Ligand binder design. Structure first.
Ligand SMILES: Cc1cc2nc3c(=O)[nH]c(=O)nc-3n(C[C@H](O)[C@H](O)[C@H](O)COP(=O)(O)OP(=O)(O)OC[C@H]3O[C@@H](n4cnc5c(N)ncnc54)[C@H](O)[C@@H]3O)c2cc1C
Ligand SMILES: Nc1ncnc2c1ncn2[C@@H]1O[C@H](COP(=O)(O)O)[C@@H](O)[C@H]1O
Lengths: 255, 319
């Protein structure tokens, strides 16, 4: 019994970041990298399933990305993931959600897991696409935005709740194996912020430069730019006068 | 050419994002002669033809599949057959929880252009140019779809304006392709937790986010809210943690605060999903120590200061 968890190391930007000379991305010098927030919850859900079971449950984390990503995979192993896999070649640079879905599927084919978990979306690009693209290439049952999972290892069905707009959920019975995208709040991850990572090349999974990268993506980036955004009226001063302005605004509202 | 719009309904009600997409489709088409085709999918979807017989709809296709409401196998199959039948240049879906269940699967099988959560779209000549966000909404990413005769976009809700008035589409009925779904929908559910206030009805909200830190810090904001005559609401992490009831959560998964005139957002970054619940509020005050927080891009007033220091001074001045 095996659960495969696809994880992304996302980038967040420091203040005063700049667009790189070619205009296709932000300068990497302004990026801070960490595990995608949604992956904390999906990894925790796999671990909860592992701990609730007397049957062995292998939890395998997999990420497509350059060598910086090993730091995040190492942290997953430290939380009790059994194995971690990084897939990369430089040709994979610029791969969108659909191409990454394809690459992930080639690993999943070899791992032959009983369930695949992915996050609802990434905190950086927020495509909300990668996990369900994997489901297409696998041709597996799937559901997106899973906030509850009733599943025991080896069951051929599970019952999920998907989190809908406007304060409601929908219970859905889904055939297993399945791909699920996992929403924030499904559990309370316990670790709130020597076994090597397995390194896999495109060649290892039967792919070449022609299968991946920007040229095989389903849209082309023309440019990335810092837009003009709306601007607040910043209240400067001491805490006391900032509070005084808020009260005046409150009073204006009340009268 | 044709632009195909996939409408959305749930629990017998048409979701208003449907009409936004029709607005988007009509604004996008290059020529008077181009047609907007709207599809509504469900076993009881004929009920929605009056509500979709509106300005800017040239053709309305009622697709009867096996499920009442959204099912990802049913939808992917149906939309794939709609694309085949109508050969649209552009297909518009809502960036909704339903679409998340199938949009990218649809795009993986075929050579279709694809981008999600799009909030600017136009033709430059015959070239479709779409804009979405990058790096937690800190940039715009502008994309095109070279050589793609069909492009599927999911469209950010509450960006594109609906048209006004009725329409007279050519209405047609089709059966969805006959393939058995690998899931079955069961009950809709609203989860437990206190529900003493309907936050869609209140006019003055103080809302707390992850910036409050530990659960022990909730009480001081409850006290502030009470002293001010505001209703205490929150962002998702507070409610997910069980620190305030889900009924107080503002945003996509929570509630839209339609009656709110004054919203004080304390320790909330302003994610897109939080904004969905409160960006319409006429006077928004944000209190946040990160000047780069998205919330300041919609706030009327901003205070780059510690929320605990602000809360305590506010309380003292109010007394
Ligand atoms: C399908 C889906 C539905 C969703 N629905 C909702 C929804 O209904 N509602 C919702 O809120 N989110 C929703 N989200 C979740 C959303 O993506 C974000 O995770 C969430 O909005 C972030 O909440 P936050 O702003 O409180 O936390 P954060 O983004 O972590 O922001 C915390 C903020 O506090 C500030 N801060 C920290 N310390 C202090 C201090 N001492 N003084 C002042 N400021 C401080 C920080 O600068 C930061 O900006 C949804 C997401 C998905 C994918
Ligand atoms: N490079 C990647 N490697 C592994 N999983 C990924 C990668 N990119 C996205 N994902 C998965 O998709 C989720 C993010 O969704 P998206 O916004 O579609 O990228 C993550 O939580 C992962 O489960």
């Amino acid at each position: 019994m095996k659960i495969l968890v696809a994880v992304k190391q996302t980038a967040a930007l420091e203040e005063d970041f700049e667009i790189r000379e070619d205009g296709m991305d932000v300068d990497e010098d302004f990026m801070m990298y960490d595990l995608n927030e949604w992956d904390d919850f999906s990894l925790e859900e796999a671990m909860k399933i592992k701990e609730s079971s007397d049957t062995d449950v292998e939890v395998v984390v997999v990420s497509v990305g350059p060598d910086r990503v090993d730091e995040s995979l190492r942290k997953c192993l430290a939380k009790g993931a059994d194995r971690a896999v990084r897939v990369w070649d430089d040709a994979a640079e610029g791969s969108d959600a659909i191409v990454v879905g394809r690459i992930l599927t080639e690993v999943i084919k070899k791992e032959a897991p009983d369930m695949v978990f992915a996050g609802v979306q990434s905190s950086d690009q927020a495509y909300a696409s990668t996990g369900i693209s994997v489901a297409s290439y696998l041709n597996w049952p799937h559901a997106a935005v899973v906030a509850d999972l009733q599943y025991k290892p080896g069951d051929n069905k599970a019952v999920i709740r998907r989190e809908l707009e406007g304060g409601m959920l929908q219970e859905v019975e889904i055939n297993c194996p399945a791909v699920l995208t996992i929403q924030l709040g499904i559990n309370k991850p316990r670790y709130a912020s020597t076994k090597p990572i397995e390194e896999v090349s495109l060649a290892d999974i039967g792919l070449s430069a022609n299968d991946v990268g920007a040229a095989q993506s389903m849209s082309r980036v023309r440019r990335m730019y810092i837009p003009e955004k709306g601007r607040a009226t910043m209240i400067e001063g001491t805490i006391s006068e900032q509070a005084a302005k808020i009260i005046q605004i409150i009073n204006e509202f009340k009268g | 050419s044709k632009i195909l719009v996939i409408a959305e309904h749930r629990r017998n009600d048409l979701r208003p994002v449907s009409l936004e997409l029709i607005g988007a489709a009509n604004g996008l088409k290059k020529s008077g002669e181009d047609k907007v085709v709207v599809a509504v999918i469900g076993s009881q979807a004929d009920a929605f033809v009056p509500a979709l017989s509106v300005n800017g709809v040239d053709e309305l296709v009622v697709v009867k599949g096996s499920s009442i409401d959204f099912d990802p196998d049913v939808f992917e199959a149906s939309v794939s057959a709609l694309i085949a039948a109508h050969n649209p240049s552009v297909v518009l879906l809502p960036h909704s929880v339903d679409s998340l269940g199938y949009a990218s699967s649809l795009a993986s099988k075929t050579g279709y252009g694809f981008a999600t959560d799009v909030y600017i779209v136009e033709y430059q000549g015959d070239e479709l140019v779409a804009t979405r966000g990058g790096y937690n909404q800190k940039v715009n990413v502008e994309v095109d779809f070279p050589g793609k005769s069909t492009v599927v976009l999911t469209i950010r809700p509450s960006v594109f304006k609906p048209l006004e008035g009725a329409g007279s589409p050519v209405v047609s009925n089709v059966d969805a392709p006959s393939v058995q779904s690998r899931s079955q929908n069961k009950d809709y559910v609203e989860v437990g937790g206190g529900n003493d206030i309907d936050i869609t009805t209140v006019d003055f909200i103080m809302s707390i986010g992850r910036g409050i830190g530990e659960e022990t810090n909730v009480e001081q904001f409850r006290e502030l809210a009470d002293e001010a005559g505001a209703t205490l609401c929150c962002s998702e992490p507070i409610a997910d943690a069980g620190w305030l009831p889900k009924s107080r959560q503002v945003g996509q998964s929570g509630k839209v605060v339609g009656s709110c005139k004054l919203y004080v957002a304390m320790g909330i970054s302003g994610s897109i999903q939080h904004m969905a619940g409160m960006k319409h509020v006429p006077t928004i005050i944000a209190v946040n120590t990160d000047p780069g927080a998205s919330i300041f891009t919609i706030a009327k007033y901003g205070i780059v200061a510690d929320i605990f220091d602000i809360e305590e001074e506010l309380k003292a001045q109010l007394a």
